[PDB]
Paper text:
A stilbene O-methyltransferase, SbSOMT, is first shown to be indispensable for pathogen-inducible pterostilbene (3,5-bis-O-methylated) biosynthesis in sorghum (Sorghum bicolor). Phylogenetic analysis indicates the recruitment of genus-specific SOMTs from canonical caffeic acid O-methyltransferases (COMTs) after the divergence of Sorghum spp. from Saccharum spp. In recombinant enzyme assays, SbSOMT and COMTs regioselectively catalyze O-methylation of stilbene A-ring and B-ring respectively. Whilst SbSOMT shows global structural resemblance to SbCOMT, molecular characterizations illustrate two hydrophobic residues (Ile144/Phe337) crucial for substrate binding orientation leading to 3,5-bis-O-methylations in the A-ring. The catalytic residues of SbSOMT are highly conserved with all reported COMTs, including His282 as the key nucleophile, whereas Asp283, Glu310, and Glu342 collectively charge the basicity or confine His282 in its reactive conformation.
To rationalize their different catalytic regioselectivities, structural analyses involving X-ray crystallography and computational methods were conducted. We solved the crystal structure of an SbSOMT-resveratrol-nicotinamide adenine dinucleotide (β-NAD) ternary complex (diffracted to 1.72 Å resolution, Fig. 4d; β-NAD was utilized as an additive to improve crystallization), an SbSOMT-resveratrol binary complex, and two ternary complexes reproduced with pinostilbene or pterostilbene (diffracted at 2.10 and 2.56 Å, respectively). All complexes were in high structural resemblance and depicted as a homodimer with an open conformation. Superimposition of SbSOMT and SbCOMT (PDB: 4PGH21) revealed their high structural similarity (RMSD = 2.322 Å), except that SbSOMT harbors an extended loop (Val103-Cys114) that forms a threonine-rich dimerization interface. Close examination of the SbSOMT substrate binding pocket within the SbSOMT-resveratrol-β-NAD complex provided further insights into the interactions between SbSOMT and its stilbene substrates. The pocket mainly comprised hydrophobic residues, and the stilbene backbone was secured by hydrophobic interactions with Met143, Ile144, Met175, Phe189, Met193, Trp279, Tyr311, Leu329, Met333, Thr336, in addition to Leu28 of the adjacent protomer. The apparent binding cavity was confined to fit the stilbene backbone in a planar configuration with minimal rotational flexibility. Of the three hydroxyl groups on resveratrol capable of forming hydrogen bonds, only the methyl-accepting 3-OH group (A-ring) formed direct hydrogen bonds to SbSOMT residues, including the catalytic residues His282 (2.80 Å) and Asp283 (3.26 Å). Other hydroxyl groups were shielded by water molecules and did not directly interact with SbSOMT. Overall, these structures depicted a productive substrate orientation within the substrate binding pocket which greatly favors A-ring O-methylation.
Numbering used by the authors:
A (entry chain B), B (entry chain A): 15 to 377
Amino acid sequence: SARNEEDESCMFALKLLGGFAVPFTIKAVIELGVMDQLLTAERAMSAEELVAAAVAAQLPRPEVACTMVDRLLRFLASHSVVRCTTEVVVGTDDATTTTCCRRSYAASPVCKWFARNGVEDSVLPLGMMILNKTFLDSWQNITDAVLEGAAPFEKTYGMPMFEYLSTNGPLNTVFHEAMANHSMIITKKLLKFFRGFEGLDVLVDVGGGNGTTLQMIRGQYKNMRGINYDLPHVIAQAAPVEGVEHVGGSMFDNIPRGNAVLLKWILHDWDDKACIKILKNCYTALHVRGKVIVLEYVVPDEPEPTLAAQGAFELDLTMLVTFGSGKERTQREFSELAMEAGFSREFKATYIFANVWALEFTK
Amino acid sequence: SARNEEDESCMFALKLLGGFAVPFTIKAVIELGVMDQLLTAERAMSAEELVAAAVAAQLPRPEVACTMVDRLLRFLASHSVVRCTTEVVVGTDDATTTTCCRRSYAASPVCKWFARNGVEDSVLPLGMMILNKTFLDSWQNITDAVLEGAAPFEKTYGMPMFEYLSTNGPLNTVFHEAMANHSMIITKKLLKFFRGFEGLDVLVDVGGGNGTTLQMIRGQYKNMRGINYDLPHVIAQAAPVEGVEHVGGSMFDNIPRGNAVLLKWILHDWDDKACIKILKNCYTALHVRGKVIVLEYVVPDEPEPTLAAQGAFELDLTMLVTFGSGKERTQREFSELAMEAGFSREFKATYIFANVWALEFTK
Ligand SMILES: NC(=O)c1ccc[n+]([C@@H]2O[C@H](COP(=O)([O-])OP(=O)(O)OC[C@H]3O[C@@H](n4cnc5c(N)ncnc54)[C@H](O)[C@@H]3O)[C@@H](O)[C@H]2O)c1
Ligand SMILES: NC(=O)c1ccc[n+]([C@@H]2O[C@H](COP(=O)([O-])OP(=O)(O)OC[C@H]3O[C@@H](n4cnc5c(N)ncnc54)[C@H](O)[C@@H]3O)[C@@H](O)[C@H]2O)c1
Ligand SMILES: Oc1ccc(/C=C/c2cc(O)cc(O)c2)cc1
Ligand SMILES: Oc1ccc(/C=C/c2cc(O)cc(O)c2)cc1
Ligand SMILES: [Cl-]
Ligand SMILES: [Cl-]
Ligand SMILES: [Cl-]
């Protein structure tokens, strides 16, 4: 009992230190093409069967590849990421790590989110960014960054992340593909569950990229016109989109005038002082009865041990790593920034999807 | 609800991809000195108090340091690693990330396992190895290593781990300190929970280092003599230990004669053929009724979703990453190695601590 408490404590400590193993194993199973074979399978498949289906090339050590994949999948099975069944081996099977016993694996429902197909909703492009080595290396440098009051990313690479992307075309692509993926999913869910675009004549999308988000919204709200507001080098590359003015500039200088401003994953990149500048520009830009629509996660008031709360605090540490002073906020924190920027004590919150809320502040 | 099912599924997918954040956060809290302040505190302490207690040097941006630490500990609290209490701030406090509310933190029981200073009951040296950048970087190269049937470490660094350690003095130290730490903990638990040293006249300790393990065992069993059998260059550096003879040699060539041979975390580094060679050298070194004592994890016959099983399969993946063909084994697998090496069909297993079993095979 006391023996067992000591034992359980030590095992929990080791579990806490080893949490990187699941993500890194999933990454390999995806990259090998094995996850996609699980996703299109009609039945449970052995590691040998999955390797044969995923990998076109002749392998130099095919049995060793098979036994390594078996071990990767066994581990994922113990975490319920895949389903496993075990059958007795008749004869010799060198493609299982256990001579006696052959495992076959099937996808769990969660695995659809790892689809490379793209056809239904997947978060694989976002996951490619989450586990990108460039970004992961920053997490090893938190200590020194904290002692300097700096972003771990900047301590690691010597410049802010957004500048770094200008210097690294491949990472720039990873980052933009991740953002576009998350944006597509959230915009679809917004159109299903959120009613705050009703009645709007003009929506200003800050960071609107090539105008795809506005295009999708305008598709549900045919009367609405859009202002796609983004940096000049972005706006330069945007093709014409029906009903949308592409406008270049900086949101710290000015925001175009409209009936609502959309801020999707913008404010969490910035400290309070910077957020108040943005929101003051929103305030001055809006017409009366106008709204800022903020699409962000919302951290709870206290550190609750729920899946949703842990997710929000994990994004907070991602913002800490990436930006230092970027951060996730509580509902109260968002309201306080809004009030500092001049908005009224009128607050709407609508839950959208995957920890994202739509928060609305009104002039 | 199909909506809520889809939402939970997606959040779960993201949780699975992000599991590295907790280990990296724990590493930073340890490195900063904050964890050791939690361990010695008399009461809950704010991030500001903890940074003041942990960091003697003046910081360039001390308020930013404190808010970052607050965010690291808030995340850990959401994972039950520390306890958190929240009190209303009177005045203005800019060393909490939430200006309304100041959190204070206290160690949970698990935190004692992260203690510095080589203290009683810590796995910190082992943890240093677990989260070492050189060793972690191999986990990014699993896909390509599988395709070649190679160890990820060897794919990453261009040679096996044991060879590479010879060329990297800091990493060699990290490795040996980790092994020594785990050995110390397990040896103390053995002396508490394991019977099998009783009646032994001579115990051979393969990989016995400087003879510390045999020294501890002799502490309890005064009439037992020890042979410390390690690589010649390790033996060269071992100071005399009463009742222990230091002997240099390859365990692949032979093993010194004794009443028992101890193999701790040896077999799991090696494939079946290499294990059978070691155990056959053990068999020749023993007389009838001599024993091999194997200290290893034991993986279950099916991938059970337990804390214990997940820990054993995680070590299996560590072996895959480090050695490729090193692996964790089932009880059946260990029995089948012993019988191949000539041992009798006579098998004892005693659970020790932190997933380690003592398995005994008899000649
Ligand atoms: N970061 C801080 O510590 C902090 C604190 C207070 C205020 N600020 C304000 O933020 C500035 C930092 O930015 P900068 O000087 O490089 O200016 P900038 O206008 O070039 O903006 C830099 C970043 O802002 C974002 N951005 C700007 N306009 C945007 C738009 N229309 N759509 C989408 N994203 C847009 C982009 O991500 C870009 O990389 C400070 O100089 C100050 O004005 C910063
Ligand atoms: N896979 C195998 O069967 C295998 C592997 C390596 C060496 N060997 C044989 O061993 C002989 C010597 O070759 P080598 O010098 O390259 O091997 P070695 O003696 O260096 O042994 C290889 C590894 O075994 C471990 N080791 C060896 N003896 C040990 C001991 N007493 N205590 C703890 N760890 C120990 C070390 O990690 C070492 O790096 C050769 O005959 C070789 O073929 C066989
Ligand atoms: O939780 C844990 C995580 C990792 C480890 C590693 C152990 C280990 C043991 C060896 O003999 C060699 C090695 O290179 C690594 C143990 C426990
Ligand atoms: O589960 C998740 C893990 C990581 C992320 C990262 C989001 C993100 C958002 C930004 O606006 C900028 C950025 O650099 C990163 C989101 C979800
Ligand atoms: Cl092969
Ligand atoms: Cl520009
Ligand atoms: Cl400061």
